[model samples]
Target: WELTILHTNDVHSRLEQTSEDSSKCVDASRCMGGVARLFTKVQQIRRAEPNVLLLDAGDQYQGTIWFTVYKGAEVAHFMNALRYDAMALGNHEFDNGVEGLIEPLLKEAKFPILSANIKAKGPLASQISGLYLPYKVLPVGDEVVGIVGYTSKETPFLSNPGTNLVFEDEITALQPEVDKLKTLNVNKIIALGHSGFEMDKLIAQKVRGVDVVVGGHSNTFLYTGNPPSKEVPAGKYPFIVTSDDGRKVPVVQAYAFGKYLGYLKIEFDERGNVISSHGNPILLDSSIPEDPSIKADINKWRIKLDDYSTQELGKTIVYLDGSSQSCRFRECNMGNLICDAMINNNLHVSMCILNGGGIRSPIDERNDGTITWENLAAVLPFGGTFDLVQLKGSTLKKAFEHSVHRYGQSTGEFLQVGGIHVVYDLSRKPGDRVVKLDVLCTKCRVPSYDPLKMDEVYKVILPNFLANGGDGFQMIKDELLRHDSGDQDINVVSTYISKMKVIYPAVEGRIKFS
Candidate 1:
C-alpha cells in the first residue's frame, strides 16, 4: 500500500472569494476557494487515498478581516474540521502579539503545530531544544512515517509582529531530529517545512536521509511543465520538484492562499528510501462546488464581520486614479491619494509618507457604486496602521537617504515625500551625500529653513513598522524624536479606503523619473 500525502501550503486566510459580486465566475458564483472548499476537496481526495495526510505550510493567520477580527480562533476551527495532521509555524502568526496566539491554543487547534526553529520566550523557552519539536513519527498501518518540521530562521529579520520566540539555524537544529528519526526504525521520513522551497532543497542536500519534503514559505507550483521531463525553467514562477537525494523524494508546495492543492504520490522500498514518485500541483477554482457545510460557517463569519467591511472612516475629499505601470514610478494619483488621506485623517502637525510596497490592488469602484471591506482589505492586505512622530532635520536627512538613492544604490521605492522635497545626486555616499535639503513646510516651504536653527518639529506620520525602521530603513529609528498622542495608529488606510467612491492609479509627476 503506497502512501499519498496531500498538502496545502501558505493558505493565508483567503477564506472568502475576493469580490462580493456574484457574476465573476462562470458558475455565476460570488467567488471560490477557502478552508471549507479545501475540506471538501481534501475529503474527496482522501476517499481516493485513505492513507492520505494533510498539512499546512504556515502563514495561517493575517491577510483578511476574518483572521483580523477572529485572530486564529476561526482558523483553528476550520483546520480542526479538516483535521490537519500537522503544520509548521509561519512568520505572520506572530502579527497579533502573544495574547492573540493564545486564542488559537485555548479554543481552536486540535492537531499538532511544529516549528523547530522557533523558541518560546518569557515562560515557554525552557522546552525542547529552546523551541518546539525536533520531529514526530506517524505509524501508517505497518510502516512508521517519520516527519520533521522546520520554520524559517530568518524570522528575526523578516518578521517583527510582537514575536517572543527565538529562531535556530535551519541545518543545525534539523540535523539532530533527522538523526533521531533514523534511530526510531521509521521506514520513511518527510519534512513538513515552512522554510520556503529554495531553502528546503538546501536542507535536503545538507541533512541526509529525508525521503520527501512538503515545503512552503516560497510557494512553489509543482508540475507546471510536461511530466517525466525535469525541465525546471528559469524565472518562470517556481514549481516543486525532487532534489538530488537519489530517490525522487517528491518536494511539494501549493501556491500561497489555497488557490491550489499540492499532490505527491510516492513508493517506498523495504528500507524506507523512496523508490519512485510522481508529483503535480492543482488549482482549486469554481469548478469545485464549495462544500455546503463549510459555506454556512463562512456566511456566519462574513455576517459577523459586517461592521469592519461597511463602516466609513472619513470623506475621501479626493479621488485616486492611476495604473500599475505609472504607480511603479511612484508619481501616481492613487499613491498621493493614500498619502494625503494618512495626513488629513490624523491630527498630526506635519506630513505623511508611505512606501509603495504597502499600497495594494487596483482599488476600482464597482458598477453597483458601493465599496466593500473585502475590497479594502485586498488593497491594504498587511493591516498597516499610521503613527505620528517628531524627527530633527539631521535625522530626517538620514531617513531620506535610506528611501532615496542610498550609497549610490536605488533602495526599494525611494520616494522622498510631499511635506518636503530634497535633492539627491545618487553619486555620493549616503550620510554626507545630499547636495540640497528644501523643507516643504509652511515657513520653511520656500528656500527651506536653516539646518541649525531647526527648533521647529514637524508632526510626521508613517507606518509604525517603517517609523520603527522596517524594510531595512534604519534612518527612521535614528530620527524619531518622540511618540505623539492617541491611537492615531488605527488601520486608518483601510478606513480611508472604505470611504472612497473610486480609485485611479495616476502619476502627478510629483516624484519624477530619470
Candidate 2:
C-alpha cells in the first residue's frame, strides 16, 4: 500500500560539505550536508523504511573545485558510496561535453543514469544509446514500481549535447513512455528526472499513470512545514496535481546543493492511484552528524583544492557585488564584469547577456585588490561555458522583454548585458517590457552603437544555459544556428582580469527600468 522515496536534485558537487549558508566550506563548525550528512540521514530512512528507493534528480555535476579538478570521477565515487539507485543527467551533465562525460557514465557509475526525451541518433549514438535508459524497474517491499525519466529538451543550447542526439519536448516524449510502462502491468509508476518544478506539475496533470514526480533543474524549495533552514518554499512539498485521468499525483523536489534531502511516502490503492502522501525535505543542518568514513573520503580529495584556490588570479579594485537581490533584479558590477569578459572572448560578438542567477558568490575586496581561483569559481560556478548565436533584432527585443517579464521578482532570467543598452518599462505587462534598445556594431569597421532595427540580424554571446532556453528564454531556444564557442567562461573572465591587472566594473546604465 505504501512506498517511500528518498530523493535529491542539483547537488552541484557539494560532496565535501557546505557552510550553514550553503556555500563552500571554510569553517568546519558551521558546516552541514556533505555526502556524509546525507549518508547518515539517508541510511536512517532506509533502515526504517523497507520500501525506500533512493534517487537523484540529476545535476550531480560541476560547481566546485572538486568538479573543476576531478570532473565526473568525484561524482561517481560519492554517489556510488551512497548507493544511489538511479540518477538523471541534468543540463550540467553536458558541461564537460559528451566525450568528457562518457568515461564516468560508462565505467564508474554502478547505477543507472536516465532520460527519455533524449533520442540517440547520428554517429556517436551507440556510445550513449544503451548507457542512458528511459526507465528502471525496482521491487519495493512487495510491490513493483516503474520509474520513467526525462531531461530538459534544451540541452543542445544549454550544454554541448553532441550532434548524435535529439531532445524531445517533455510532455510529447513522456506520454508514450508512461503508456508503455502501463502496458507492462507496472501499476505503481514514478516520473523521476530533471525538468524543473513547473514542468513536473504539468507532467502530473498531463501524463497519465504517473503516481509521483521527483524532479530537479529549478533549485526550487518546496516545503510544507514551518520552513527548513533559511529557504522559503516556493510551493508546498508534494504538491498534488490531478491528472487528466482524475488520479491524484504528487510532484516533489528537494532544493539544490545537497542542503536538503527529500523524503516522501505515498500510499496507493491496488490501481496504483495515490491515495495519500506526506513528506518534507529534511534540512541537512549541523545537528546531523557526518559519517566518519565519508568525512575521510572528502578530506582525501580536498587536498587538491587548497593549492589552486590560494593562488591569486588578479585584483578587483572594488568588491564585485553579485548578490541575488541586486543581480537578479537590476544591473550589478559583477554582471558587468562577466558580460565584459564575455565580450572579451570574441570581438565579433555584438553583445553579451548572461543570467544573474549564474553568479553564485561575491568576490570580497582586499588591500592588494587580489582575487584567487577560488573567489572567481565561487562567483560563476556550475561549470561556466559560452555560446554564440545570431538573432534578428526583433527576437533580441523579445529576449530583453522576457528578461524583465517578472518585474521585481529575482528570477534567473534577469539578464546582465554588455555591448547593448536596454530600457524596460516594468509598469507595462510582461512580454511588453522592452521600451528602448540599442546594439553595438560588430561588423562595422569603426566601433559604435546604433538603434536596433527590427529586420537586422545581430550576433550575441551568452551563457550556454541561456542560449539553450534556460531561465525561460523562449525567444532564443533553438531559434537559430549557434556556433559553440566551446570556450570556458571562467577562463575567459580570468584572462580578462589578468590582462587588465586591476578590475573596476561600473554600472553604465546598460539596463534601465522605471
Cα RMSDs, all models: 5.8, 4.4
Highest-lDDT candidate:
2
Q: Residue-wise lDDT of candidate 2 within 73-96, one digit each (tens)?
A: 999898889999888778888888
Candidate 1 lDDT over 381-487, as tens digits, reads 66556777777766666665566553322123454254454456656665555566555454443533333224556667777667767757676767677865423
TM-score for each of the candidates = 0.76, 0.83
Error of 1 at 466 (Å): 1.1
Model 1: lDDT of residue 398: 65
Q: Can you tell me which runs of candidate 2 are displaced by over 4 Å?
A: 314-326, 340-352, 357-370, 381-399, 406-412, 418-422, 435-488, 496-512
lDDT of each: 0.62, 0.83
